[PDB]
Design a protein around this ligand. Sequence first.
Ligand code: 5I4
Ligand code: 5I4
Lengths: 272, 258
Amino acid sequence: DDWEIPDGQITVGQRIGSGSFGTVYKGKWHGDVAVKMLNVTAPTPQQLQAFKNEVGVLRKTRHVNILLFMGYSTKPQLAIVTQWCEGSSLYHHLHASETKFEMKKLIDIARQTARGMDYLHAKSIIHRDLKSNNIFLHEDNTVKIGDFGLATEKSRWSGSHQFEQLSGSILWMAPEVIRMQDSNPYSFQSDVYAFGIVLYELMTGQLPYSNINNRDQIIEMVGRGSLSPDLSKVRSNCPKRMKRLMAECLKKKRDERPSFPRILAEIEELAR
Amino acid sequence: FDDWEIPDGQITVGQRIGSGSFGTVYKGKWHGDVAVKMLNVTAPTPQQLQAFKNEVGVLRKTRHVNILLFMGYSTKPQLAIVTQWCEGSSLYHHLHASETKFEMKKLIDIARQTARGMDYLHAKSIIHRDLKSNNIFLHEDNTVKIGDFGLGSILWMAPEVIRMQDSNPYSFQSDVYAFGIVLYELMTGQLPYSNINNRDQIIEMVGRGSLSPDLSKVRSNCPKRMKRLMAECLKKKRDERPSFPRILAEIEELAREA
Ligand SMILES: Nc1nccc(-c2sc([C@@H]3COCCN3)nc2-c2cccc(NS(=O)(=O)c3cc(F)ccc3F)c2F)n1
Ligand SMILES: Nc1nccc(-c2sc([C@@H]3COCCN3)nc2-c2cccc(NS(=O)(=O)c3cc(F)ccc3F)c2F)n1
């Protein structure tokens, strides 16, 4: 309640993108800011609590490669206020842009996002949706990890709506639906895997399985355990140490991936 | 699709009937009585509108006496869906707060009408996802209206996470099971697991197959043919469960005996 921004201080600007949740707009508040709004008309007490909890998570981050939480509102609509990034997503640079990156820059980007992720796990925060689209290249040299995935727990945003809209329905739930209620596949190791995919894009310039245009076989083959990215797609000058690190983060069996403190030492060392 | 929108001002919103963080339901006037379900959305984005136009699309596919009648929708003053107004109470209210004691004859009729509507939805490839006696409105105390349906990172998903994208427990058979539960409360007049009363316990025990509705409680004058139908819908293994075409044909053949 210390970070609540009084209303009428922010001048909301141009919409930058939307979602099933709401909208992100550029804004003016002691300078440039991004504003993530939940366009809920009349949030429920439980929706408000789940919002406080997400703000609880964000306010414990303070690191240069994590998008900076600056404040939150609840007065008109639920809102989260962050620093404003200039430039584009890492996805846009790698995949939708003419200009490509030197190897030394790619490794530096890999290093910055390992620092952020190492910082998150040190603080027991799982990102849950790490992808190159969620890595903003601020001023086109500073990684800012943002757009935290939706936590499944009954104390966070999505889990509160999942647990609220099925709270009074369990008596009618087939066993197979019950079992799927409480799930959560997300871990530190799952974060590490996504990071391996982010490395795959940096070091190849492409998205994995660009050769499998079916959401359904990817799901079956990667899930089933027989399909993993094509590492012979890494560029000529990718260091073999970077390739080895990659294969380790991408191991199919979850408890076989490395932790981020080890991941980080490795990249800073090889950047040499 | 543009031909089912109701322009701003035509609907007169009355008593609030029920809230929730996704929407609120009102009684309204529009060429008579209607129910207005307001979505808790202010100025919907592109993607929320396409989600909305997509779900109205499903509701636009239903025309059946036992399916709550879709009548229209609005985008201002707010996103809303408009349906017929049902007179009376839900089935849940009747069984568990009125003790109306619908003599068996009607208990079966209600189960016939509910199976009629479910067979219709399934024949349209619509899974309800939340069938229960709260969502079965007993219009004028005679007609069943089933209402209240429920509902780009795979490249970055580890095998264990990508597996969950491949599940979805909601199927024609989980609708059948929920129908089996409604049957249980018609024929016992009681909710399952009354004795237990601990959501965590029930979640854990049903999910693993140690706990099942105590069929010892179906009343004495309950036709055991549909006591056996109840038991078939409630099979823990979802593939051991019957389809609605067969559920309906069965439940309509015992109603002849009256
Ligand atoms: N230029 C610029 N600058 C900054 C952000 C953005 C965009 S662009 C976009 C994408 C773009 O496509 C359509 C909308 N989605 N999202 C943000 C943004 C905005 C707010 C929050 C988050 N993520 S967060 O979990 O809420 C978070 C909150 C917090 F307090 C601290 C750390 C966090 F990680 C965001 F991803 N842009
Ligand atoms: N008296 C009376 N009459 C009729 C309805 C209701 C109530 S009461 C209630 C619950 C009661 O408990 C607390 C308040 N909420 N809901 C409706 C209602 C209102 C609108 C839609 C739906 N379901 S639907 O998916 O959106 C749908 C939309 C559609 F177009 C066609 C078929 C559909 F199934 C509804 F369940 N009441």
